Write a protein that binds this DNA or RNA. Structure first.
Ligand SMILES: C[C@@H]1CCO[C@H]2Cn3cc(C(=O)NCc4ccc(F)cc4F)c(=O)c(O)c3C(=O)N12
Ligand SMILES: C[C@@H]1CCO[C@H]2Cn3cc(C(=O)NCc4ccc(F)cc4F)c(=O)c(O)c3C(=O)N12
Ligand SMILES: [Mg+2]
Ligand SMILES: [Mg+2]
Ligand SMILES: [Mg+2]
Ligand SMILES: [Mg+2]
Ligand SMILES: [N+]
Ligand SMILES: [N+]
Ligand SMILES: [Zn+2]
Ligand SMILES: [Zn+2]
Lengths: 184, 368, 368, 184
DNA sequence: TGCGAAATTCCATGACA
DNA sequence: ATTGTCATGGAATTTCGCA
DNA sequence: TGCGAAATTCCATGACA
DNA sequence: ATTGTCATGGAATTTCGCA
């Protein structure tokens, strides 16, 4: 068999609803399987339309052979299927209630939700502006399994933004207490 | 005046005036019989005024000024007095064209890595499309990889929005641009400082200096034109198509597409190269690093036969950028302070500000 | 389709397909193992569509199109099928730039006599001066002698008024002009016919063709600029001064002023040449006739290494004169009807009108 | 002494009042002494100002060493003298009531007045437009004394308008009768 | 060890206001 | 304190297929 | 029948939208 | 059915003044 490559497979998923930010409520998350490279797109809804719109941006930079998703409505619509077929992209779904990716992608997605939560405290409404910095953090994050960041694996070079601090990512006792004030 | 010319009439030799000729008086004026005819020898004290009167008929240069003077006069070393006045005539100096070419162009080293240097620029205005009129073009120096953003104005504000989107991917060491208002504003400078991005600026009114991106502008407009033949100019929806199309086009001299140079492997686009299907990614990246260092690089062409290259202390003149109708095309002489490279200099204008300028927007002041 | 490629699989030789290579079937497709790797050999019936798909990604030329195709396919004589499609692609043909230079310029014979040929043209608009905005410039071909008329518009009507004043002096055989509206109107044509004056017209959008006068325009604007330095742009009152100044300026290559060429003797202007003071007028006119026939005349320069010269029957394309934003810069191919001279042709456009055009506004259609 | 030349001497004079034509009433007449070449300029009056204005046109083409005139006011004013001095033109006047030029100029001036009179009959008001054709006629008119037209003597070439007809210049019995109707 | 043709490389030309 | 570029399609040169 | 300097001629460069 | 031109000022080349 042939070694795994960038653009072989993109794993996509939605995250939200979030508190509104510049009118946006969700984040479409795209992770490259081989590299762990992440792309984030703000949407107003988890619809086929908002998905096509965001993926149009991404697929004007690189087109994956395969898109993998759960069986969310946005991804199982016949429109989204038409969209994929036009671009020669194979669609691939996990079985309902049984999500699967790879250890790498699962770990990456965990990081994304955790990094996000850490930042929407104190500023639940300002996450729109932080998406660029979130992605840079995630993509210049050392991989224990491989010796290399997603950046390094996608471009074959060191980045001009090395996040040298392996950061806390855990909530400090202050952040835990004021996050239980926004809900309760 | 009287003195010099008196010793001449009586027959004593004066340096400059050849002795084999008959010098005399007539009509109260010193004369001489030269092959071309009989000319008046004015007193030295009169000569400047004469050269000036002749020059001022039509502000002529060396020979056309001489030809007028020679009609009536002769004296030793006439052209020297003509050239002297040409060098002091403000109107001729700032109005005349240059007749010396710039030295041959530099071919600066290709940046070593993707993201080492971006070149940015605007195209437009264009026919309105979905309310948009401009395109921000971003070209990675190493790879040629290009990003396109539709905008309503060539504003700093629109530039910032677009680059926030782009830098999501990676942050470049350097951003090179021309001196458009969008890029030279303090707001844009802060935005760069915040991210550790160094702003590099073209010498003014010298788009050669943004050549990497200007050249990509041409390809963009060209493909847009072809796609729009026979249809209305709805370019907005075509930007993504063009971007993808150009980032995946081969440069025949390189044998690589810009996407290949950036990623070392084609994505799922038509006619994807399949040559590294059996290498590991790591092996693939190793071949890529190699490919990147061995790309063709052009060299400085031969100088033209009448080129000038600048020297510290030289009098030179800066081209007026947007000269009004019937106004000079050149500024007053200024002095070369430093030769940054053979095609770029710092000058002290007469104000005097330090200015960094292209040799292409300079002429060496004539007649020293 | 099936046919051609079947005999190949069983091991029989087909012309075009080199025999030393292993041809086979896999995944339901004919393949081959070439040094660069394994490529698919599509059936001939499929090849056109492939070349087309590859070309259309970004409307690339020969090599960039080939490089895409070679990624997946091999067949005999691929570039021939690529070139075939480039030659039929309307969008590439009308949009791409030419990469062949025009043949070297003609240096037409200087008209033999003053008044044989006038060159006329407008300059402007200029900053308003006494309500005037334009200057009609009239240059006698033989002498360079020039007349200047201030006007409010580049109208036929203003042209007629000015030339009625001028032709008071003498009537020229020919008047050469570009295709400005002033000169191509039927009113102007009648005005010329009435006086036995032949109207000659530049090929369109080719000011080289009015070179004699365009070049004098430069001198006019240049002297005007100098005289106006530091003052407001009141050019109206300077026209007479400039006219006189230029008609009495030496051309260093000729050693004569235009006034001298016209009259054979200076008038009472500063530094008047006095060399023929002892000749009779008749003797003077005799020397003049002589001077006129022996003036320096330049010759056709060397061709550039990649020039094209036109041939009856060639497909060629006319440059669009004022192309809209994002629209092609070239018209559809047309045919050379007649080669008037090596730099001028009559073409039949596709409409078809006969048009007389400069080679400079033409390219030879690529790929035959 | 040195042979006579073009631009050596210009002889100038006014003619009029005439019937109005495009608002003009007079013609300033300039004849080159050596060639007989004639230039005509319409003016609204025989003033120094109208003279300076017309001669400004002519002297932007050629400047005479000497201007010769009678002692008309326009020519004897100190303004006209200033004008001439600025251009290095010597002024020269005939003695009052005793006009003089040369046979050539006298003959030329006679021709001008006669050619003009012949044309302002039937069209006393349309002479403005005819000044170009008048000058061409006069300047391409064979000189009995010299073998050459003024055109030929000024430019050293044949003209593209040879007036091959040595014309009547005399009034036909019709023109004599209808010219005695405009007056009487 | 050398031929004819095909493939590849060279590079002038022009256009990014 | 900065600096030309590179698609294009004929022509020139090199390599291929064969012997 | 030859030297140094001055005069003249050559000609690339650029600009007439 | 038409077509480049020519001022400019350093450099190259020729001529001058002298011997
Ligand atoms: C108002 C800003 C700041 C001041 O300057 C202006 C005008 N400008 C002019 C060109 C231009 O002339 N491109 C043609 C071109 C010519 C020669 C070459 F080698 C390369 C070339 F692209 C630009 O491209 C451009 O971006 C600008 C621009 O941005 N600005
Ligand atoms: C509306 C008319 C009819 C159609 O064409 C236009 C535009 N045009 C353009 C130029 C011009 O581009 N001059 C620059 C130039 C460039 C190269 C060269 F070798 C000589 C040169 F003078 C003119 O001079 C000119 O007179 C006109 C004009 O009259 N018209
Ligand atoms: Mg710009
Ligand atoms: Mg630009
Ligand atoms: Mg014109
Ligand atoms: Mg013109
Ligand atoms: N460099
Ligand atoms: N000719
Ligand atoms: Zn001057
Ligand atoms: Zn095409």
């Amino acid at each position: 068999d042939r070694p795994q490559k960038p653009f072989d497979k993109f794993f996509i998923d939605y995250i939200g609803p979030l508190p509104p930010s510049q009118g946006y409520l969700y984040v479409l998350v795209v992770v490259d399987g081989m590299t762990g490279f992440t792309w984030l797109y703000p949407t107003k809804a988890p619809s086929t339309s908002a998905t096509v719109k965001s993926l149009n941006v991404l697929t004007s930079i690189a087109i994956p052979k395969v898109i993998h998703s759960d069986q969310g409505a946005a991804f199982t619509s016949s429109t989204f299927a038409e969209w994929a077929k036009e671009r020669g992209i194979h669609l691939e779904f996990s079985t309902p209630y049984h999500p699967q990716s790879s250890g790498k992608v699962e770990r990456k997605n965990s990081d994304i939700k955790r990094l996000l939560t850490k930042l929407l405290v104190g500023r639940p409404t300002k996450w729109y502006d932080l998406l660029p910095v979130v992605q840079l953090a995630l993509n210049n994050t050392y991989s224990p399994v491989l010796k290399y960041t997603p950046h390094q694996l996608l471009f074959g070079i060191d980045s001009n933004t090395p996040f040298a601090n392996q950061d806390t990512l855990d909530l400090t006792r202050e952040e835990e207490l004021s996050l239980l004030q926004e809900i309760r | 005046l009287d003195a010099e010319l008196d010793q001449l009439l009586q027959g004593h030799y004066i340096k400059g005036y050849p002795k084999q000729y008959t010098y005399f008086l007539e009509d109260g004026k010193v004369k001489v019989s030269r092959p071309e005819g009989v000319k008046i020898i004015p007193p030295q004290s009169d000569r400047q005024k004469i050269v000036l009167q002749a020059h001022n008929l039509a502000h002529t240069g060396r020979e056309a000024t001489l030809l007028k003077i020679a009609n009536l006069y002769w004296w030793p070393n006439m052209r020297k007095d003509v050239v002297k006045q040409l060098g002091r005539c403000q109107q001729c100096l700032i109005t005349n064209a240059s007749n010396k070419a710039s030295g041959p162009i530099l071919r600066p080293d290709r940046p070593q890595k993707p993201f080492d240097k971006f070149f940015i620029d605007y195209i437009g205005p264009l026919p309105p499309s979905q309310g948009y009129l401009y395109v921000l073009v971003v070209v990675d120096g190493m790879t040629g990889f290009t990003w396109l953003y539709p905008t309503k104005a060539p504003s700093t504000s629109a530039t910032v929005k677009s680059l926030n989107v782009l830098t999501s991917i990676a942050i470049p060491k350097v951003i090179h641009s021309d001196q458009g208002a969008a890029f030279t504003s303090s707001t844009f400078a802060e935005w760069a400082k915040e991210r550790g991005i160094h702003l590099e600026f073209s010498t003014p009114y010298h788009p050669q200096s943004s050549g990497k991106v200007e050249r990509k502008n041409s390809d963009i407009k060209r493909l847009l034109t072809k796609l729009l033949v026979g249809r209305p100019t709805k370019w907005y929806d075509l930007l993504p198509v063009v971007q993808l199309a150009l980032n995946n086009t081969y440069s025949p001299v390189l044998k690589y597409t810009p996407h290949q140079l950036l990623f070392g492997i084609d994505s799922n686009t038509p006619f994807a190269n399949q040559d590294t299907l059996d290498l590991t990614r790591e092996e693939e990246l190793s071949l890529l690093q190699e490919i990147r260092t061995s790309l063709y690089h052009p060299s400085t062409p031969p100088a033209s036969s009448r080129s000038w290259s600048p020297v510290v202390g030289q009098l030179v003149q800066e081209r007026v950028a947007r000269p009004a109708s019937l106004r000079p095309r050149w500024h007053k002489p200024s002095t070369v302070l430093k030769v940054l490279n053979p095609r770029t200099v710092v000058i002290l204008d007469h104000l005097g500000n330090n200015r960094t300028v292209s040799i292409d927007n300079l002429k060496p002041t004539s007649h020293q």
